[PDB]
Amino acid sequence: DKDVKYYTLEEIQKHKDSKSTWVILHHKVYDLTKFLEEHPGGEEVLREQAGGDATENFEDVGHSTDARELSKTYIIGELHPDDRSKIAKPSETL
Ligand code: HEM
């Protein structure tokens, strides 16, 4: 296609099992499937939610700017323009 990798909530929510753990973090989508162990913090903490707004979780901990750039290195594509009129996504806080 010509657009980026705009993926929908349902699709991303399917990328959280078997051995594909995605997370949506801000207005973009990140594959961390080969970052699980590599993540300086762990797999489990990262796979805890998966395929949902982990933004709240990521922002709770805040993260250093290193992570904000390294995040871009994991950028597969973006959150579909569908759920963009309402970025608001009430989910688990933890
Ligand atoms: C874009 C995806 C992410 C990247 C690239 C990333 C990167 C990093 C990096 C570089 C660190 C080391 C601390 C620092 O930033 O200076 C870190 C630590 C950590 N991250 Fe992430 N992270 C991501 C997503 C997440 C998410 C969604 C969670 C929560 C569900 C999480 C939980 C943690 C925790 C708990 C630590 C601290 C470990 C500890 O001190 O015990 N991270 N992350």
Curated annotation (Swiss-Prot):
GO terms for molecular function: electron transfer activity; enzyme binding; heme binding; metal ion binding. It is found in: Endoplasmic reticulum membrane; Microsome membrane. It is a single-pass membrane protein. Heme binds at residues 39, 63. The modification N6-acetyllysine is found at residues 2, 5, 14. GO terms for biological process: response to cadmium ion. Keywords: Acetylation, Electron transport, Endoplasmic reticulum, Heme, Iron, Membrane, Metal-binding, Microsome, Transmembrane, Transmembrane helix, Transport. Residues 4-80 form the Cytochrome b5 heme-binding domain. GO terms for cellular component: endoplasmic reticulum; endoplasmic reticulum membrane; intracellular membrane-bounded organelle; membrane. Cytochrome b5 is a membrane-bound hemoprotein functioning as an electron carrier for several membrane-bound oxygenases. Belongs to the cytochrome b5 family. This is Cytochrome b5. It comes from Rattus norvegicus. The lineage of its organism: Eukaryota, Metazoa, Chordata, Craniata, Vertebrata. The chain holds residues 6 to 99 of 134 of the full protein.
